[PDB]
Enzyme design. Structure first.
Site, PDB file in Angstrom:
ATOM      1  N   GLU A 223       0.950  -1.149  -0.069  1.00 40.62           N
ATOM      2  CA  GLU A 223      -0.140  -0.072   0.153  1.00 40.62           C
ATOM      3  C   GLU A 223       0.875   1.232   0.111  1.00 40.62           C
ATOM      4  O   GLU A 223       2.072   1.280  -0.032  1.00 40.62           O
ATOM      5  CB  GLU A 223      -0.759  -0.107   1.310  1.00 40.62           C
TER       6      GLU A 223
ATOM      7  N   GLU B  92       0.243  -5.101   6.456  1.00 41.31           N
ATOM      8  CA  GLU B  92      -0.192  -6.663   6.783  1.00 41.31           C
ATOM      9  C   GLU B  92       0.726  -7.225   7.469  1.00 41.31           C
ATOM     10  O   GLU B  92       0.710  -8.508   7.719  1.00 41.31           O
ATOM     11  CB  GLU B  92      -1.164  -7.112   5.732  1.00 41.31           C
TER      12      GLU B  92
ATOM     13  N   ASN C  91      -5.858   5.662   7.394  1.00 46.40           N
ATOM     14  CA  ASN C  91      -5.625   4.802   6.145  1.00 46.40           C
ATOM     15  C   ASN C  91      -4.748   5.664   4.970  1.00 46.40           C
ATOM     16  O   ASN C  91      -3.959   4.905   4.498  1.00 46.40           O
ATOM     17  CB  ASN C  91      -6.910   4.124   5.753  1.00 46.40           C
TER      18      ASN C  91
ATOM     19  N   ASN D 159     -11.569   5.751   2.550  1.00 42.47           N
ATOM     20  CA  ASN D 159     -10.284   5.424   2.231  1.00 42.47           C
ATOM     21  C   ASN D 159      -9.489   6.130   1.472  1.00 42.47           C
ATOM     22  O   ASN D 159      -8.552   6.820   2.284  1.00 42.47           O
ATOM     23  CB  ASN D 159     -10.635   4.185   1.420  1.00 42.47           C
TER      24      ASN D 159
ATOM     25  N   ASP E  74     -10.464   2.633  -3.446  1.00 49.03           N
ATOM     26  CA  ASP E  74      -9.407   2.389  -2.451  1.00 49.03           C
ATOM     27  C   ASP E  74      -8.523   3.865  -2.579  1.00 49.03           C
ATOM     28  O   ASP E  74      -9.177   4.801  -2.293  1.00 49.03           O
ATOM     29  CB  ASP E  74      -8.553   1.199  -2.371  1.00 49.03           C
TER      30      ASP E  74
ATOM     31  N   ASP F 163      -5.793   9.594  -6.992  1.00 48.24           N
ATOM     32  CA  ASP F 163      -4.810  10.725  -7.391  1.00 48.24           C
ATOM     33  C   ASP F 163      -5.522  11.398  -8.698  1.00 48.24           C
ATOM     34  O   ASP F 163      -5.984  10.585  -9.482  1.00 48.24           O
ATOM     35  CB  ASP F 163      -3.264  10.095  -7.774  1.00 48.24           C
TER      36      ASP F 163
ATOM     37  N   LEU G 116      -2.439   4.018  -5.946  1.00 48.44           N
ATOM     38  CA  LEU G 116      -1.515   4.029  -7.077  1.00 48.44           C
ATOM     39  C   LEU G 116      -0.656   5.468  -6.735  1.00 48.44           C
ATOM     40  O   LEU G 116      -1.207   6.158  -5.848  1.00 48.44           O
ATOM     41  CB  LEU G 116      -2.143   4.278  -8.352  1.00 48.44           C
ATOM     42  N   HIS G 117       0.275   5.755  -7.519  1.00 51.54           N
ATOM     43  CA  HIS G 117       1.115   7.067  -7.490  1.00 51.54           C
ATOM     44  C   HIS G 117       1.823   7.246  -8.717  1.00 51.54           C
ATOM     45  O   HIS G 117       2.334   6.231  -9.273  1.00 51.54           O
ATOM     46  CB  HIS G 117       1.892   7.023  -6.349  1.00 51.54           C
TER      47      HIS G 117
ATOM     48  N   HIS H 211      -3.088  -6.438  -4.011  1.00 44.88           N
ATOM     49  CA  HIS H 211      -3.288  -7.255  -2.930  1.00 44.88           C
ATOM     50  C   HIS H 211      -3.229  -8.705  -3.375  1.00 44.88           C
ATOM     51  O   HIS H 211      -3.069  -9.573  -2.422  1.00 44.88           O
ATOM     52  CB  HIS H 211      -4.521  -6.993  -2.016  1.00 44.88           C
TER      53      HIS H 211
HETATM   54 CA   LIG Z   1      -1.088   8.211  -4.353  1.00 52.52          CA
HETATM   55 CA   LIG Z   2      -6.077   2.446   1.358  1.00 50.79          CA
END
Ligand SMILES: [Ca+2]
Ligand SMILES: [Ca+2]
EC number: 3.8.2.2
Length: 312
Positions: free
Chosen positions: A19, A35, A118, A173, A227, A230, A271-272, A285
């Site tokens: 994440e 996790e 989160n 989220n 989730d 961006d 994402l980024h 995941h």
């Molecule tokens: Ca991001």
């Molecule tokens: Ca998240």
């Protein structure tokens, strides 16, 4: 709805709950492993990924008084090359590149106990908008708002205030801030995972949001939903639709996606964008891995990419 199928290239693997992808001021890449567990107890990690080799290095394994954290989302600071990290057990953390960190808040501006966070999004004014889907931070028993509506939204201000700006969300989220062309923050977008909704607010000033509205609708009836998110440079919002095998692309006005991005996996998480490129790093995941694909254009500059002493 138009769907594109870009080539996804593998970046790294085996990161439990991969994440919070983020790039720092040096262009270094980071991923959080919320996790990772040690004997059933949380022992979340913050890792640096060598993009050339895909090799991993965990720089921080946050824990306060024996309570391991569940780091889930990141934003890089502008005035200092440090990462603000949303932790499901510890709240908001500020992690240095050397691996050291500090716990920002035990309680908010109203004296209420802090909730586990989160994800977070910096606006151009330097204010950090944070989603808090978990219950009270450690030492409190872990709880998450997937079923009940006790998820909150915070705004950690430039003057150091942890202000709860809203609550009663069913697992808030992803979160992102829309800016005017001159750099003015004016809209906050919040993903509420299970309800398949993207909510919006008008940002009236630091820690001041109004006019809560159902801004967009996430496709599917699968377990999961919006989730991470961006904006690209044209203000199109790309949202990882956990469980749908797609990243949704909403136009500047929201509503229904105007295009979808098919992923070679079912659970895109976050994402980024890589600064100065069209490359979007995606965490998922299903394989606890990180991938990358080319989007149609460059990403909207993150707060860390802006200049304090910028003339224009
Ligand atoms: Ca991001
Ligand atoms: Ca998240």
């Amino acid at each position: 709805i138009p769907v594109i199928e870009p080539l996804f290239t593998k970046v790294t693997e085996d990161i439990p709950g991969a994440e919070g992808p983020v790039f720092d001021k040096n262009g270094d890449f980071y991923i959080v492993a919320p996790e990772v567990e040690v004997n059933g107890k949380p022992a979340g990690e913050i890792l640096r990924i060598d993009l050339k080799t895909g090799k991993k290095t965990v720089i921080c394994k946050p824990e306060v008084n024996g309570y391991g954290g569940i780091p889930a989302g990141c934003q890089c600071d502008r005035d200092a090359n440090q990462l603000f990290v949303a932790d499901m057990r510890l709240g908001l953390l500020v992690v240095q590149t050397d691996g050291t960190f500090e716990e920002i808040a035990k309680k908010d501006s109203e004296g209420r106990r802090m909730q586990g966070c989160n994800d977070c999004a910096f606006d151009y004014e330097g204010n950090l908008w944070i989603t808090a889907p978990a219950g009270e931070v450690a030492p409190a028993d872990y709880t998450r708002s997937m079923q009940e509506k006790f998820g909150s939204i915070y705004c950690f201000t430039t003057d150091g205030q942890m202000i709860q700006v809203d609550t009663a969300f069913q697992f808030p989220n992803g979160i992102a801030v829309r800016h005017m062309n001159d750099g003015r923050p004016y809209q906050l977008i919040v993903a509420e995972t299970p309800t398949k909704k993207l909510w919006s607010y008008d940002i009236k000033g630091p820690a001041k949001i109004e006019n809560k509205k159902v801004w967009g609708h996430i496709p599917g009836t699968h377990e999961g939903g919006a989730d991470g998110m961006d904006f690209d440079e044209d203000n199109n919002l790309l949202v990882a639709n956990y469980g749908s095998s797609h990243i949704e692309v909403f136009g500047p006005d929201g509503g229904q996606p105007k295009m979808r991005i098919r992923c070679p996996f079912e659970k895109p998480s976050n994402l980024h964008f890589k600064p100065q490129t069209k490359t979007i790093f995606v965490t998922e995941h299903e394989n606890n891995a990180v991938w990358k694909f080319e989007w149609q254009r460059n990403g909207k500059k993150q707060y860390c990419e802006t200049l304090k002493f910028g003339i224009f």
